[PDB]
């Protein structure tokens, strides 16, 4: 997903997902300790720095190849042979964040938490879970899709307090892997012969431009909502583990 702006949701689908996940936690009055949300907000600058750093600097964005932002659950690999993937990377920062948190280094903690949440968010993007890059056929579709997502994401907010609490075990890798599995299952709802043909025709046809966008909207809605619920449960796990 996009993360074009550091502290605004406008063109930062990642921040939006996290914010909506936090809202889910706030809406839950039965199992969530609201002081957790208070801490996330207290150290929001650092949290957001982390979410934004993933796509903008080393080592997080792997020299602009973003290799660590992909993870295919069936073979456990990213799109570049031998490169680190999103499961191990997201878990890495989940733990670093936790250790810092326990050592009372809050800025370090939430900065790393932000990074981890970013990686978890990415595996929820079907293309990231299927190693479909902006270079994959049809080339350019990946970027155009994520930009389009920002224009409609606000129409898919989860409005209840039902995050996926204890969705997977205590291992963050299981959560990242699990989210990727579901995302890959939904891949064909975004990338298929129809969307590929229409995207290509969009080059010289406004009709087809609106066509593929409409076509990928329903599944995009599903992915955004799933991403919010999973992220909410992941954050809850983090606090349960290190708090
Ligand atoms: Zn992303
Ligand atoms: Zn992407
Ligand atoms: Zn990313």
Which CATH number covers residue 133?
1.10.575.10
Nearest CA-CA partner of 176 in 81, 70, 35, 97: 70
- Return the sign of the alpha-carbon dihedral for residues 50, 224, 189, 186: positive
Which residues make beta-bridge pairs with 77?
72
Residues whose Cβ atom is located within 5 A of ion ligand 3: 54-55, 69, 122
Residue 224: which residues within 8 A CB-CB, separation 6 or more? 13, 17, 149, 153, 156
Q: Check: CB of residue 236 under 8 Å from CB of residue 230.
A: no
Q: Check: CB of residue 216 under 8 Å from CB of residue 199.
A: no
DSSP assignment of the chain equals: ----SSS-STT-HHHHHHHHHHHHHHH--SS--HHHHHHHHHTHHHHHHHHHHTTTSTTTTTTTT-GGG--BTTTTB-SSTT---HHHHHHHHHHHHHHHHHTT-HHHHHHHHHHHHHHHHHHTSHHHHTT--TTSSSTTHHHHHHHHHHHHGGGG---SS---TT-S-S-HHHHHHHHHHHHHHTGGGTSSHHHHHHHHHGGG-HHHHHHHHHHHHHHHHHHHHHHHHHHHHHHHHHHHHH-
Angle at 212 between CA 207 and CA 215, to 5 degrees: 120
Elucidated via: X-ray
Resolution (in Å) of the shown entry?
2.0
Query: Which residue of the set 46, 48, 69, 150 is catalytic?
Result: 69
Query: Which residue of the set 55, 72, 150, 186 is catalytic?
Result: 55
Q: Is 177 an annotated catalytic residue?
A: no
What is the residue range of 66's domain?
Answer: 1-243
Q: Is 142 an annotated catalytic residue?
A: yes
The count of other CB atoms within 10 Å of the CB of residue 202 is 19
Domain count, the chain: 1
Integer angstrom CA distances of residue 177 from 8, 26, 92 = 28, 26, 14
d(CA 107, CA 228): 24
Nearest CA-CA partner of 142 in 210, 190, 204, 106: 190
């Amino acid at each position: 997903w996009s993360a074009e702006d550091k502290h605004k949701e406008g063109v930062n689908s990642h921040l939006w997902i996290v914010n909506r996940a936090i809202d889910i936690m706030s809406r839950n009055t039965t199992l969530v300790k609201q002081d957790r949300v208070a801490q996330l907000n207290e150290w929001r600058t650092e949290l957001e720095n982390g979410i934004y750093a993933a796509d903008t600097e080393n080592p997080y964005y792997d020299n602009s190849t973003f290799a660590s932002h992909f993870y295919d659950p069936d073979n456990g690999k990213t799109y570049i042979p031998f490169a680190k993937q999103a499961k191990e990377t997201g878990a890495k920062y989940f733990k670093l964040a936790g250790e810092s948190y326990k050592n009372k280094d809050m800025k370090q903690a939430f900065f790393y938490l932000g990074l981890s949440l970013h990686y978890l968010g990415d595996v929820n993007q079907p293309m990231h879970a299927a190693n479909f890059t902006n270079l994959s056929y049809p080339q350019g579709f990946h970027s155009k899709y994520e930009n389009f997502v920002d224009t409609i994401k606000d129409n898919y907010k989860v409005t209840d307090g039902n995050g996926y609490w204890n969705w997977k075990g205590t291992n963050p890798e299981e959560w990242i892997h699990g989210a990727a599995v579901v995302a890959k299952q939904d891949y064909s709802g975004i990338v298929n012969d129809n969307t590929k043909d229409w995207f290509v025709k969009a080059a010289v046809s406004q009709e087809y431009a609106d066509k593929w966008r409409a076509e990928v909207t329903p599944m995009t809605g599903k992915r955004l909502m799933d991403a919010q619920r999973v992220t909410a449960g992941y954050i809850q796990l983090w606090f349960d583990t290190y708090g």
